[PDB]
Every structure is written in structure tokens, then in C-alpha cells.
Amino acid sequence: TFMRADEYLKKRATIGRISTGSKSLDKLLGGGIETQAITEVFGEFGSGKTQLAHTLAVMVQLPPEEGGLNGSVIWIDTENTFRPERIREIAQNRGLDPDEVLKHIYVARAFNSNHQMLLVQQAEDKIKELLNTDRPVKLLIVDSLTSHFRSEYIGRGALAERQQKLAKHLADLHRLANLYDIAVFVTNQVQHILAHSATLRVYLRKGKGGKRIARLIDAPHLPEGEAVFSITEKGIED
Amino acid sequence: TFMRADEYLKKRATIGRISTGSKSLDKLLGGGIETQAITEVFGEFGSGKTQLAHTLAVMVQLPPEEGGLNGSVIWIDTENTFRPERIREIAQNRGLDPDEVLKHIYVARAFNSNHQMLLVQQAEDKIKELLNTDRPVKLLIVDSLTSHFRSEYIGRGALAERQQKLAKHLADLHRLANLYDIAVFVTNQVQGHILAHSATLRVYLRKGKGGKRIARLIDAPHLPEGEAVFSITEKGIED
Amino acid sequence: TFMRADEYLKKRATIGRISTGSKSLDKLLGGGIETQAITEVFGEFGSGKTQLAHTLAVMVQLPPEEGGLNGSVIWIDTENTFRPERIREIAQNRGLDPDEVLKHIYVARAFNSNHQMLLVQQAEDKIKELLNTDRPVKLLIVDSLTSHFRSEYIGRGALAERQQKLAKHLADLHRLANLYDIAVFVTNQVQGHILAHSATLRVYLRKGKGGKRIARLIDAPHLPEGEAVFSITEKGIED
Amino acid sequence: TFMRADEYLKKRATIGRISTGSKSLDKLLGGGIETQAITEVFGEFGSGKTQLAHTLAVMVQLPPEEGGLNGSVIWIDTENTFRPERIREIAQNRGLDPDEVLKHIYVARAFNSNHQMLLVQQAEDKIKELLNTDRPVKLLIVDSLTSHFRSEYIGRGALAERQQKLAKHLADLHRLANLYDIAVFVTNQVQGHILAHSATLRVYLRKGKGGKRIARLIDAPHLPEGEAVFSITEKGIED
Amino acid sequence: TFMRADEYLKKRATIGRISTGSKSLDKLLGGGIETQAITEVFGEFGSGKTQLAHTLAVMVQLPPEEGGLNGSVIWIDTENTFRPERIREIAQNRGLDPDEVLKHIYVARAFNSNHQMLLVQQAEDKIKELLNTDRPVKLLIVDSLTSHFRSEYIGRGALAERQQKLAKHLADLHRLANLYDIAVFVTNQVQHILAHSATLRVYLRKGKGGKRIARLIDAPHLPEGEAVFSITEKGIED
Amino acid sequence: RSIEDLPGVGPATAEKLREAGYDTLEAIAVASPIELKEVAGISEGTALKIIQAARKAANLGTFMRADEYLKKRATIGRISTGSKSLDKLLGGGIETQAITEVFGEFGSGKTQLAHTLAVMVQLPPEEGGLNGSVIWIDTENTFRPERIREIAQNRGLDPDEVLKHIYVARAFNSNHQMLLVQQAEDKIKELLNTDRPVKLLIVDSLTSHFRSEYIGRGALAERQQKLAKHLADLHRLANLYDIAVFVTNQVQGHILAHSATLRVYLRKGKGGKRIARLIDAPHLPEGEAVFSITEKGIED
């Protein structure tokens, strides 16, 4: 069904924003990563996109004033890179209770493409039974989003099917994002494949001495420069 | 379906570690290959990855204080390379009862890819069978993991189903590793090259100076970034 | 299902060995071709691998001291090269009743790949029957093993399925080999050159010096290295 | 032939810097394009690299305190894009005498690669000619540098001679830049793609928001790692 | 002419060794880079091989006891990356006189392959008129050695000629190395082309947090591990 | 006429001809006036006279009566590898008047075998040598006079003495390599008619530089021609002076000495031991040989 541009405009206003935990980024990002959208972060291994994920898993928990959305987190881990113990750290280094955070984050290990996709659909369950609660789900992470797809589908003749499925997956996320005002954050290791339906794609690379530099890939809807930040306790900062 | 970050953090701390039988290799691995994980060791033929497998089949059996996890072993052999006589020897020189050790290792010969994949789904029963015991399964070996796949699936048009099924195999192993706190060890001969992408940790090892072998990681984060030397002798892996 | 390493040490303990009929080649094979294994012999046409097959079909029949295993023989013939007359000669030329040996050899002509695979599948029933008697099946020959496969499957987009079947075939043989302590001997003519990768052991042989042959192993793991010369005569193969 | 590390260190400190006419771009460049160097600016057609060239042809003329180096300009035009009227306008709005400025810029139209390369060797005389003056040559522009090369040398078998000669051209420029403390500025249109590899610094710039342009470097070490925005107006480049 | 294994053994003994300025390296290197040899260091851009060059340009100047050879330096710069001012720094941070160093280093900017090659042959001049002196040439750097070759020779049909010339160049260096007991250090940026005639090839990459890790590519004549070090004043250390 | 004692050739001319590879009577014998004219400067007509002189003077351009040839072969010496096993396989050891090529993967020990041979050849015939000197062309910087010292002082040989009958030259590229051959003939005749003439000439590696300087399908053609000539230059020395030529070839592009009198393949074996095998049936056995690397070089 098609809603009216009334409700539509209204909704696009009730769009929340999670802070990345680093001034410079939230800036170049126009607030931060938004809900009702899929934000894709991509770059070489070690470009810190999994750290950014961890940080976001904290930020979203704190009050709007600090850049959060007082919400829960659903984390689909495909590369076995989710470290709760990492949450604990960064957390007890920016106020919040380092043992409370790990109470509003729910993870699932995805062992292959089909598993990954099936988990997303089940994510609606935990998501659902929680909208009627003080801390609903506001962040849904898929790290990595492309990992399995680019390994199970090698050689043309599969590329077609790969996109079809990848697409159906992305579509499943988009739905959740809008259906529940959730911010969908996905990572993509690069050096190909992208998340075409992505609402916003941010590229980041290792920069200079122990620092990462981002830069959106678009033009309309947000700045056109670069943003530098670093990895420390508190996750990302600056 | 999902788990609370605190539970995951909890479950994780319950992760055991098997010693390779080498101070060195062990340091490199962070004390040894872990449970709830798939560790892939790969290298040229004769790089000693099958020895490492045999050693681990012993170590896991001894007490935590000694490097093991007082557990049993499920061994899926695809290249007919499992030698109990070699377990027995690694044991004998380690001061154990060869006759006992050989009672907590269970093998199955895998004659082809479909067989191999079938075996893994089958192990689940032996795991369950011993699970509620004092010596549950703690090590599951697949040697070789890639051997059959890289021989039954030739050329493109095949990679589609290969990875397709492989991925399904690795996923079967991952489940067991986590569902039962088991350490999954797999070997991969490397000169159509395959890989255990889903592998939790990939260790590369090659032959060295004289009779020695050297191992190195395939990741900078998590664990150091150096090399480890060791040797093959009675007791399996030393140094 | 699976099997305890100790009971495996048991199974492998009973590995028998058939003599090739020539001191030389046995040294190289460390005694002879073994049971619970697939031994592949390959070489150009006329390299004498079908003679080696005939000799083995006799030797396996005589006592362990004499180098046999007092066993019967199952022979899948795909190139119409099995000559019972030849067995008689080699047999009456080795302290064996010619007409009795032929009562412990069972042949089947394989007319194409599907037939061949279907025949090995049927061998089981025959194996099972003689399993309880004094002379069980101890030798299963497939000559040629690759012949039909490399003729019914031409061009890629076929080569892939060939392996998917050739592998199901080899797996069928491996099973019988272990399930019944049988030695599986297969031949492969070599000048698309397919091979029996699963081959527990691959022996290469070529026409040598003066009307003699010469064989060598392929690899390094388990068993010496070097070459072995022998000849074709009555008695089949002789040093 | 060679020089003492102290002399080189000395010669280097004698390196002048021309302002692009943009606080921003200037910061990004470390105060501006330097002498004794080849600065390559590249981007899509209309990214304003020819404007930047025109601005520099003015800036260089004014005092050091003002961003110039009180010098003359040698301009090798290959795409017939040099407009004195535009110099005159950039000057006029910068508070200078269009009639004067146009007296310290010397152009030559290059009709093809060989012509282009000839011109550079020729400039050396004008450089010498003005060298012992109070307003020596301090800026040498080649716009476009790659235009002709990427049109006269089509396909492989050509790249050999292209780069071969190009390299020889760039080397000719490098010499002049150092032999006479001149800043060499070259443009390169980018959608057989060429490049000034020997370039001392490569700056990439593209069109932006509205009428604006944005420049970024092609090196992490030496100078920052950010972007710079500016605009095209009278005075040439602003912001 | 062929010398006798007498003189030959003698010579291979009178082989000097320059320290890299970092314990860990000199170790994995069996002393350090030796004279009468071409040592090739290769790795990605920013792997610090030009720093290593700078350090070596200092070390070689100090007495044997500290790991030097009280010698001069000939530096062929092809990528305009030689910073005397960088020498000054590192120098006045490990004893020696930060303004004396730049007195025993002689540079030449090579603008292309032919220039590069021709400079090497002229290097014999400065080299020569200095052997009869307190501080003879002991280090000859070519940074980068491959830069120009891989740019002027693109597309097969040149690859052949490229190797021929590259070869003649390497041979020219080898000669100088032996003819004058000089240590030849050459860099090679990678991600192809190598310096085949190279006496020793060391690979180095950026490692962990602001550190570089080396590892020889051979087996016979020196260890088989890796070496970590860092870039600071003094150039390379650890 | 033996060397450039040819009619129209003076030293200056000889200079240009040598720096160009026309270093032998046969080299010139097979050239064309145009080539020599462009290499030396001489006129097309005198160059022609030069060619004819060479065609007529050529040593290896004459036939030998089989009775004479049977005898030449009767005087072929044999160097021991230092391994009963291997020698059996060679029927005594590598022979003189022949090019023996040993090839295998890096580390298959062919450079060790070279070092051993450089010692053996020095001891008496009964000891496994021919009381001779050694010319060593090193292209990969792998000649360690130290290993020589060792292997020598481990067979009761005076290392300080052994080191006095080995002459090395480092070859920095193909042209250098080829060039050093002609200069090898200089030293060979120098030490010729001496208590210890040259009996062993090593080229290690023989192919290294050729497979690096000639990359391409357009480079392949002349790659072979130059190797062909280089090999011919060695064959000549081998026969002209009863020398045993030993060359190594790393393998696994692809190259080899097609005109090698005998090609021996060797690979890393069991544990620390190497196994060498022959590549043909005519002349010599047909089995494998195992040996090891230790002091004394090669053993067993």
C-alpha cells in the first residue's frame, strides 16, 4: 500500500539518529547514522568498521541528548567478530554501566548465507516483542553482510543468483528498518559486491598514524569532505 | 535464536584451550586451539599438519593443568592417514597408557565428499552419547577437510555447488563447535584451491631447516603476528 | 557409525598382503599390495599391468607363508582382457592346481561405465557369501578402471560429472576394501588422463630394458622409494 | 653529478611557493605549489584545472608576501585554452594592471606531441633570457600535458614509445624545475589513461555542489590528507 | 678473470656490516646488510623502506663498534624522497653531529630509467676519488630502483628489453659492490618486477599499531622468523 | 691457426670480435661477412677472407677417424660425487669431455654436489678424482669457499691447499656469463700442462640469468640461440681439454641444456637425504640413488 505524503513526511521526521561516538564523523554524516535506513560502511580489513559497529552498539543505548535513542541492539555476526568484552571496555569509559550495556544487545552467529538470511527474518521476533517496551530495538547490525555471499557464490552462473538473494536479503532489512524505525548498520570488506539498495554508503580507510578517515560516496543529502577519527576505549572518538 | 551480549560473553569465557604440545606454537595460538571454534591448519604435503592433529588427539585427553580438557575425540579421516599406532607412540613417550588413550578417540573413514559431510551430521550422536559423561568430546578432527571437495568438483560450473556444499559442511561443523563447546580442527593441503573461509582461525605451516616446521597466522588482530618453530618427534609436536 | 581407535588399531592389525610374484616389487610394495586399500597401477599399454593382475589372482590363493592369503578373487573386466587360460599357466607353474584356482576367481564383463559401477555394487553380495568360508574374497580387481570413463565422458561440462561418478565408484571400492579386509587392485592405461586419487597407493610401471618391466612408486609417505625391475613369464611376474 | 646532503638540504630550503589564490587549497598544498617540482593537477573536463593554471600565472607575479615569487611565466598550450583576457580579468579584479601582468607570461601553442616536447627544450632559452633579471621565470605551465600523447599513441605496441617519450618529456621538465628553481604545473584530463608518474605531487580535483570544485592529494606522507573546496570567479580561484 | 678461492675466502671475510638501527632487524639479518652485496628491500608504499634507507645512511657513518663502517654514502633518488633534513633529525638523536652526517652523503636525482642507469656509472667517479680517504663510500642507495623501469616499459614487447636493461643496471651495481666493498641498498615498491641478481631480498609490511615487520625470502644463510621494529627519531629502532 | 691467429685479424679486431661472442674459430667460421664487417669494422672482402681462414682452420670443424675417436673416449676421466650410490648411478661418476646437467627444485642440493665435486676432482684417481684444478662460474652468488674448506678438512685434505686449485668468477648476467667462458679458456691453457690441469668446470646456475633476461615469446627464440651457443662453447672446452663440465638448472618459462651429455634429476627425499635419478636409458643404468648432505659434502 502507498501512504500519503502527509504520513510520509511525518515519518521521515520521526527519524532517529545514532552518534558514531566521534564528533568529526557525526558531522560529515549529518547527525549520524539514521533509522529507517541501511547504512553501509566498507573498506579494507582493519579499517575499523567493526569497531564503529561496537561503538554504535553502545551509543544507541544512551539518551537522545548524548546522541542515542535509548534502544536495544540486534547483532548478526558472520565472521565471529562480536566481542561483548569489547563493549564492556568502551562502555565503562564513557559513562554508562559496562555491565548494563551487554543487557540490551542480542547476538546470533550466522554460519553461512542461508543462515544469515534466515536470522534476519527471525530478528523480527525479538524486535517485535520489545517495541512495547522502554528500550525497543533501534540498531540492527550485520557484520559482515557480504562475507558469506562472496564465498558461497563464486564464478559467474551464480553471480546472478547471488544478487537475487543478496537483494531479497537487503529488502528484508529495508523492511524492518522502516516497519520499526530501526537503524540498519552493515559492513562490507573490500579489497567485488556492494549493497546497492543501501540508503547511505560510507567508505573508510586506515589513515596516517593509527587513524581512520571516512568520506561518503554520493553528493546530495550531506557534506562533501572527509572525516578523521581514532580507535580507543569508548570505541571511536574525535 | 539470539543471545544476550552478557550470555554470549559468559558462554565465551567458558572456552577451553587444547595445547599443541609446543610451548612456542601454543604462545602463537594464545595457549592453544580453542573450543567453539574451527581452526584450520594448511600447508604443503608433509608440513606436518597431520602430526599436529595426532598430538592434539592426545593433549586434549589430559587435565587442564596439563594442557588438555579431559575430553574425547571424534576423527573424520578422508585420506586414510589416521594411525592409532602413532597416537599410542605419542602417548607412550608422554608417559600415558597407549591402551587407555586409544579408548577416547573415535574414527570414521570418509571415502568421498558426500560421505564426509554425512559423517559430521552423524558425529552429533557420539557427541551427545558422551556429552553427559566426565570425558565428553572436546576435539573434532577433519583430516583432510578439502581433499575430496577439490577432486570431485573440477572446473567452473562446479565451484558453484562445491562452495555451496562446503559452506554447508563448515556450517555443520561451526554448529557442533558452539552447540557443544568442541574444538574443531581441520587440515587443508595447499600446493581450484579451496579454503575454510568460515574458519575461526587459519594457521599456515611449512617445512623448515631440518625436520622442523614453522607456523604463522593469517590475521593481525586477535593473537600475535609472528612465527613459531617446532619439531616432529615422539610426543608428536615438541618445541 | 564410528569406531574406537583401539578397535581400529585392531582392524588395521589384520591388514594382509598379497605378493606380486617377484621379490623385487614386493620390497618396493613393502611386502605386496595390501588389503583394506586400493592399489592403482598405471602405465602405457603393454606395460604389463594386466599380467600383474593375473599373477595376483593366483598368489592371493596360496598360503600366507607362500605369500597369499588363502582367498578368492572377484574380477571386473572392462576391456575383455581376462584370460582364464593364463591363470592356469601361472598357477600350474606355482604349485597350485590349475583347475582349482579357477574355482576361486569370479569374473564379470563390464560393457560401459554404468555397468562397471553397477558391477562393483553387486560384488558385495558375492563378497558377503564367501565371507564365512575358508576362502573368502581377498582380492578384487578392476581392469581397466578408467577405460570406459575416459571414453563416455568427453569435453569439459562432462569432466565434472565423470569425477562425481568416478569418485562414487572409487568410494564404493574403498568401502568394500575396508568393510571386508579386501585388497582392491585397479589398472589405468596412461598415454583426458583421469586418475584414482583416492588410491591408497599408486604404482607406475613402464616397459624396461630387455623385454623387462620396471615400476616405481608415486610420492613419499609410507613405503620406500626407488625402482623395481621384473619380467613376464610363466608364473606371471618374476624377478 | 651529485651533491652533498648539506647542499641538497640547502638548495631545498631555497624552494619558493606560489599561492593558488585559495586559503584552503593553499593549506592543502602546504602553502602552494612549489618550485623545483612538477605539480600535476588532474580531473574531468571542466574540473577547473585550466582556471587554476590562469590564477597561478597571476599569483606568481606578485610579491612573496602576497603569495607570488615576483617571477615570469612560460606557458605551453596544447589545447588552445590559454586566454590572456582571462589573465587580464583575474588581474583586474585582484587590483593589478592587466596591461602589465600580460607582459610576464610567454606562450607557445603546441600542435602535437613532438611539438610539445620541442617547446620545453626551447623554453630553456627564455628561462636563461630572463634568469639574470629581477623577474625570472618561476612558473612553467603545460596545459594539457597528456592531451596529445593519448591521441597520437593508440593501442599497445604504442605505449612502449609513449611512456618512453613521455618519460623523456617529464625528465626534461624536472631538469628545468631544479636547474632553475622553477615551479612546473601540468594538467591531465581524466575520464589508455596516462599519468605523470615522475610528478612530484599529484592533485586530483572534481566538480562539486554548485560551480564549486574540490581538490585532494594522492599521497599520505608529505602534506595533509584531507579535501579542499574553492570556487571559480574573477581573481580566478577563491576560497 | 677468476681469482683463487684463497683471495676469494679472504675477501668474503673483509665483508663489512651496516646496522639497521634496530636490534630485532640486525638479528634476523645476521649482523646487518653486508658490503659486496645488493640488499633489496620491498613492500607496499609506506612500509618504511625509505626510512630504513635514511637510517642506514647514518649508521654506516659511525664506528664499527656501534655497527657502522666509518664510510660515506652515494644516494640515487628517483622518487624525490631523500630528505637531508630527515637525516639531521634521526642523527641528532643517536649521538653523532646532525650537521656532520649531511657531509658524507652525496645525492643525485634520477629523472628516468636512462638517467638512473647513467648515474650509477658516474657514481664510480665520486666513489673512486675517495677510496684513498678516511671515509670511503660504503653505502650506495637506489631508492627507488624499480620505479622508473615499471613506468617506462609497459605492455609486453618491452618487458623483454626492460629485463635486459634492468639486468645491465643490476650488474653495474654488483660490480661496484664487489669492486669497492660497498653495500648496495635498493628499494622496490610492490602492490610486478624484482631484482633477481639481488644478494638478499627482505620483505617488509606495515604491522599492527605503527610498526613494521620484516622477514627474509630464502632459507639458507640467515634465520627464518620475522622481525618487528618502529619508525621514530633515530630512524629505525628496537 | 689455433686462436685469432687468423689472417686479417689484429688485436684491435680480435677485441671487437670477442666483446661480441665471436671468440672461437668456429664462431667466425659460421658468421657472415656483413656480421663481421659490422662487428669489427673490417671491409666485406677481408671479413670474407677471415671467415674462410676460420672455416679451414676450425678445430671442431674436422672429422676424426673412428679408430682415433674410439681412443679419445678411452681417455675419459671420471670424478666421484662422493657417494657410492650416486656413482653407481653414473657408472663411476661425472665424466670429462661431457656436460653433465643436474636439475631439481631449489634446495635439492645440486649446489652441494657442485662443491663436493670441486674437492673430489682434486684427489688421486684411486681416491675418486683426477688430480685437477677447478674453474667455477658463479651466477647466483652461491659459491662458498668456506664449504670447500669444510668438506676438505673432513676428508683429511689440507683446506688451505684445496682452496688453491679452484678459480671462481661471479657472473652478473647472461652476457657476462657467456663472456667468462672464453676467459675460462685462457686460464685453462694457463694451468694446462701443470701438475694440476683444469679437470672440472662448474656453471652454477647455468640457466638462472637466461630465464630472467629473456621473458616473452619474442625473447624465447634468441634465448635458445644464445644458450645453444653458450652450451656449444662449453662442449668445445670439454672435449678440447678433457674437462668435465658440470652445470646446474633450477626447475619448478622453463629451460634446460638440451645438448647436455647427461641430465640427472634430483629431489629432496625422505628426511634430510636427497634422491637423484637419470633421464634416459642409453648409456648407463636405470634406477634411483639416495644420498645425503653432510661434512664431506655428499655421502653414501
Curated annotation (Swiss-Prot), chain F:
Residue sites binding ATP per the record: 104-111
Keyword Glycoprotein: no
InterPro entries listed in its UniProt record: AAA+_ATPase (IPR003593), DNA_recomb/repair_Rad51_C (IPR013632), DNA_recomb/repair_RadA (IPR011938), DNA_recomb/repair_RecA-like (IPR016467), DNA_repair_Rad51/TF_NusA_a-hlx (IPR010995), Hlx-hairpin-Hlx_DNA-bd_motif (IPR003583), P-loop_NTPase (IPR027417), RecA_ATP-bd (IPR020588)
One Pfam match: HHH_5
GO BP terms: DNA recombination; DNA repair
CDD domains: archRadA
Task of the protein: Involved in DNA repair and in homologous recombination. Binds and assemble on single-stranded DNA to form a nucleoprotein filament. Hydrolyzes ATP in a ssDNA-dependent manner and promotes DNA strand exchange between homologous DNA molecules.
Record family assignment: Belongs to the eukaryotic RecA-like protein family.
Name of the protein this chain belongs to: DNA repair and recombination protein RadA
Organism (species): Pyrococcus furiosus (strain ATCC 43587 / DSM 3638 / JCM 8422 / Vc1)
